[PDB]
Structure 1
């Protein structure tokens, strides 16, 4: 309720500017993984009902119990790095899927509140993190619709700034017209 009561301090504004900042924070975490030498592919998806899906082929947010807290690391990071917690707090629903240790780990949240303990929901050969979120309509009272062009412009800049990372943007809001933009700069 720290981020919810005063959302201005944590993200900036609750307008369209603050709405797209939700996406930048989540993507910045995937770019960090790529800069460390552990990811090379990031995918930003605008899904039905303006849900956002950000996927990377990183190491997967660790799932091991943190000795002090007594909870998995993914839970800790997302419910306070600071940025992911704020996005979680400002979202009416947030889902995380971690692909690590040949297992698929899942946790869902509501307004930053864990709905259930981290559960194992599958098996994998791949590593990476999938973060799905729906912005809180009660917080973002102006608009809850992402402007594709605003997303495309910053994604193009980030792929250019961070050479060698493939960043893809896909709009799937209307199944009748699916637009996609793939960026990858060697230079």
Structure 2
């Protein structure tokens, strides 16, 4: 209703109108860029000194799940928007705007908080769903086929090459890639340079 929500909605419209100006293209390259946008957040949180494990999973139907053991995206009610910080951050995310569905689970304050979105729009208010003794952020997203019209299927080797490189370039971070798309044949590569 307020000036805040208005700018968020205009922001989503702008990203979906010209996706290639935000992520380079809507080809297979652009699809893979979505993963790097999320993963780069976890890398920064590790470099800041608050995380050291990152897991990227290619799930059934080419959902992507990214999990870190950082502090967790904050959930406190923000001054600007009057909404949880996590909601504000994710409603301005290009990955969220270009995903048909996105989910977040924040582990923080010994609590698990959950919110879901479609094309960047929150589907309900941030909800406490359980408790935890760890901190971290889990992001699950499904790329929007309306945007990524060529393909929404990830290439394991493409993710693997860059994930390995990230681990090599950011020594000490454990980065794991797992492909669960075929439950009968699951592949996993784990990188941890010392």
Normalising TM by the smaller chain, what interval? Answer: over 0.9
State the Cα deviation string for residues 18-50 of structure 1 (Å, max 9, x = none): 000000010000001100110000000000000
SS of equivalent to 2:41: helix
Give the aligned CA root-mean-square deviation in angstroms.
0.7
When you count helix as a share of all residues, which structure comes out higher?
2
State the Cα deviation string for residues 31-74 of structure 1 (Å, max 9, x = none): 01100110000000000000000000000000000122100100
SS of equivalent to 2:149: coil
State the Cα deviation string for residues 95-151 of structure 1 (Å, max 9, x = none): 000000000000000000010010100000000000000000010000100000000
- TM normalised by structure 2 equals 0.93
Unaligned runs of 5+ in 2: 1-12
SS of equivalent to 2:89: helix
SS of equivalent to 1:20: helix
Structure 2 matches for 1:7-22, cutoff 5 A? 7-22=19-34
What is the distance in 1 between the residues matched to 2:14 and 2:132?
Answer: 36
- TM normalised by structure 1 equals 0.96
What is the distance in 2 between the residues matched to 1:121 and 1:157?
Answer: 35
- Select between 98-107 and 84-93 the one with higher mean Cα deviation: 84-93
What is the distance in 1 between the residues matched to 2:168 and 2:108?
Answer: 29
SS of equivalent to 2:62: coil
Number of residue pairs aligned between Structure 1 and Structure 2: 182
Unaligned runs of 5+ in 1: none
What is the distance in 2 between the residues matched to 1:135 and 1:67?
Answer: 31
